[PDB]
Design an enzyme around this catalytic site. Structure first.
Site, mmCIF file in Angstrom:
data_model
loop_
_atom_site.group_PDB
_atom_site.id
_atom_site.type_symbol
_atom_site.label_atom_id
_atom_site.label_comp_id
_atom_site.label_asym_id
_atom_site.label_seq_id
_atom_site.Cartn_x
_atom_site.Cartn_y
_atom_site.Cartn_z
ATOM 1 N N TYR A 102 0.441 -1.379 0.514
ATOM 2 C CA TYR A 102 0.419 -0.027 0.394
ATOM 3 C C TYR A 102 0.762 0.930 -0.197
ATOM 4 C CZ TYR A 102 -3.428 -3.900 0.562
ATOM 5 O OH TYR A 102 -4.387 -4.931 0.881
ATOM 6 N N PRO A 118 -11.469 -0.883 -0.784
ATOM 7 C CA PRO A 118 -12.376 -2.015 -1.058
ATOM 8 C C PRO A 118 -13.419 -1.013 -1.159
ATOM 9 C CG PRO A 118 -10.798 -3.119 0.073
ATOM 10 C CD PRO A 118 -10.525 -1.575 -0.073
ATOM 11 N N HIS A 120 -7.693 0.585 2.709
ATOM 12 C CA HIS A 120 -7.327 -1.084 2.677
ATOM 13 C C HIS A 120 -6.084 -1.086 3.760
ATOM 14 C CE1 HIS A 120 -7.238 -4.700 2.545
ATOM 15 N NE2 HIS A 120 -7.458 -4.865 0.604
ATOM 16 N N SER A 163 -10.306 -12.966 -3.230
ATOM 17 C CA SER A 163 -9.657 -12.893 -1.643
ATOM 18 C C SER A 163 -11.584 -13.778 -1.630
ATOM 19 C CB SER A 163 -9.465 -11.580 -1.549
ATOM 20 O OG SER A 163 -10.987 -10.919 -1.248
ATOM 21 N N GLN A 164 -10.974 -14.467 -0.773
ATOM 22 C CA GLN A 164 -12.493 -14.643 -0.186
ATOM 23 C C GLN A 164 -13.371 -13.565 1.808
ATOM 24 O OE1 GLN A 164 -14.676 -17.937 2.417
ATOM 25 N NE2 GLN A 164 -13.071 -19.201 2.039
#
Length: 597
Positions: A76, A89, A315, A531-532
């Site tokens: 990041y 997100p 994030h 991703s989950q």
């Protein structure tokens, strides 16, 4: 805290071996030969690799988490792309029904009051430690991401951003929401007259905000737009704002807030899961809600006049599973009542919420105009679909004695191969929160055993017994389940190679052949980034892709359905989100057929 495990340091030779095994089917044959040689010199006896290892173990006994710094910066803070779509997100809640403006405000009021009740838990060290909720195996997990939900801010830098911590303690006092409405920002103090404000009173307050914001003469330039641009673009624009004391005041208010609340306008003409996610990711741009934002603040809760609601996340301070635990605790609060006894239970005199003012020079007028344009390009470039896979879910998969996550991962790989006739480097997030300070490592799902299985099912299918195929399916699952354990116990490769690469950078000179190698660089170009993000609530997480020619794929696996959130960029003419989403279904369809032979 300190009794949590420290993050392991893998063996140097296990990391090198895994690395070459990972990459062999993903590069040309000569290139690999070259990689074998580079890697053999890198980790020979007396070599560079063993010196660097030695300095890693200097560091791991010395620091709580030897990769914290490196990882934060590399994932990041060093990234210069704008935060919309590339990095932040969004979680999208169910469509709400707000007959009138007060319905919208009644929703916002009850949300804020839920945020204040959640904060209090945190401030009281009253949150159940994960596995006290979530869980892993028998341990407790690191809860440091929760203490960063409301007390962070991400400062743009010219080459490197900074994650600032705190406004959280002596003070007593940081306690205020920023409310954005019509692109204006207002201070909503939650403690007035030495009393916390009730639901009612915050409703009262937000009323006043909407009146004030909708007065076209007092309307101030859309400064939130500046936050949408690229990092170094915003660092330059912020530094011009810093020259005025009014500005400076106003920026400090925003930086010390708990969170933002965005009272969005009605879109577009609308309403699907897909359209509400585009509002949450970028607001629609300039002309819609894309300037009613401030991206450097970690949580911006959107409560749209039309019913689009959710949260946009910066994030850097925390991952998705803490963002979802926080958000579900708030939803739960807004459905509870059954205990919260009587009404604007406290008071008033109240003073009206202050409007943040701004002194916007000609220079900064120009900065707005260019940020408009850049934001406009991200709005046009993103190709997004919410794909609800309703043919089965978890229940099926677990009746097959397979892991839902692993099975999804292999279905992603077959989607990708039946479109492209190759696999590519793939990122899947694996939490390392069993460890102190732990964030994530990578599961490289693009395994040689997945390439073994997907080459049957597109590839000379004519023949080829389904039972045969099933055995390849089993092998690839086993391989997927083994890499997953590897990564969640600190034994996979990404984080190790990063810290060796950074420690090279440092005291030991110009760059090594090992990290300048095109294999190493290809290895980190995640054309499939996944991703989950499971829920209990009826909500879903999304994000954009991480390379220009990539996809982002975020999935919520339920017992009877899986929700895939597929992103791509229209500028890359070789990807299509509907195409790939469709290819995931037909990959799921085909892989259940295989199970029932």
């Amino acid at each position: 805290e300190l009794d949590l495990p420290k993050l392991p340091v893998p063996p140097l030779q296990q990391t090198l071996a895994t690395y070459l095994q990972c990459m062999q089917h993903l590069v040309p044959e000569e290139q690999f030969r070259k990689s074998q040689a580079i890697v053999k010199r890198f980790g020979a006896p007396g070599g560079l690799g063993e010196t660097l290892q030695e300095k890693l173990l200097e560091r791991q006994e010395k620091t709580a988490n030897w990769v914290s710094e490196y990882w934060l910066n590399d994932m990041y803070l060093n990234n210069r792309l704008a935060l919309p779509v590339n990095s932040s997100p969004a979680v999208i809640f169910a469509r709400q029904h707000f007959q009138d403006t007060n319905d919208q405000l009644r929703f916002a009021a009850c949300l804020i009051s839920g945020v204040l009740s959640y904060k209090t838990l945190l401030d009281s060290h009253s949150l159940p430690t994960d596995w006290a909720k979530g869980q892993l195996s028998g341990q407790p997990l690191c809860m440091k991401q929760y203490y960063r939900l409301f007390s962070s801010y991400r400062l743009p830098g010219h080459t490197q951003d900074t994650l600032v911590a705190q406004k959280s303690s002596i003070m007593p006092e940081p306690e205020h929401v920023i409310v954005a409405c019509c692109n204006q920002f207002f201070v909503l103090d939650v403690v007035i007259n030495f009393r916390r404000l009730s639901e009612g009173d915050l409703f009262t307050q937000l009323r006043k905000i909407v009146k004030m914001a909708s007065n076209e003469d007092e309307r101030l330039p859309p400064i939130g737009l500046l936050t949408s641009d690229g990092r170094s673009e915003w660092a330059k624009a912020r530094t011009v704002l810093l020259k005025d004391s009014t500005n400076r005041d106003s920026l400090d208010m925003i930086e010390r807030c708990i969170c933002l609340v965005c009272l969005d306008g009605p879109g577009t003409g609308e309403l699907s899961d897909t359209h509400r996610a585009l509002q949450l990711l970028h607001g629609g741009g300039c002309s819609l809600n894309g300037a009613n934002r401030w991206y450097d603040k970690s949580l911006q809760f959107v409560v749209g006049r039309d019913g689009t609601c959710g949260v946009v996340c910066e994030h850097s301070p925390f991952d998705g599973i803490v963002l979802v635990q926080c958000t579900e605790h708030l939803l739960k609060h807004m459905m509870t009542s059954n205990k919260k006894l009587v009404r604007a239970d406290s008071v008033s005199e109240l003073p009206a919420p202050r409007r943040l003012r701004w002194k916007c020079s000609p220079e900064t007028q120009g900065h707005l105009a260019s940020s408009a344009e850049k934001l406009q390009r991200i709005v046009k470039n993103l190709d997004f679909i919410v794909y609800k896979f309703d043919n089965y879910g978890k229940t099926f998969i677990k009746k097959q004695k397979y892991s839902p996550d692993g099975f999804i991962q292999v279905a992603l790989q077959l989607a990708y191969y039946r479109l492209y006739q190759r696999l590519v480097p793939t990122y899947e997030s694996a939490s390392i929160r069993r460890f102190q300070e732990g964030r994530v490592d990578n599961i490289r799902s693009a395994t040689p055993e997945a390439l073994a299985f997907v080459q049957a099912m597109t590839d000379h299918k004519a023949a080829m017994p389904a039972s045969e195929k099933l055995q390849l399916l089993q092998t690839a699952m086993q391989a997927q389940t083994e890499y997953t354990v590897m990564a969640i116990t600190g034994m996979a490769i990404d984080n190790h190679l990063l810290a060796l690469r950074e420690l090279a950078r440092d005291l030991c000179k110009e760059p090594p052949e090992m990290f300048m190698d095109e294999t190493y660089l290809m290895s980190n170009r995640f054309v499939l980034s996944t991703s989950q993000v499971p829920t209990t609530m009826e909500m879903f997480c999304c994000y954009g892709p991480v390379v220009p020619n990539g996809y982002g794929a975020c999935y919520n696996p339920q017992p009877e359905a899986i929700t895939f959130c597929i992103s791509s960029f229209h500028s890359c003419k070789e990807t299509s989100s509907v195409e790939f989403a469709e290819a995931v279904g037909a990959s799921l369809v085909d892989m259940r057929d295989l199970c029932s032979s």
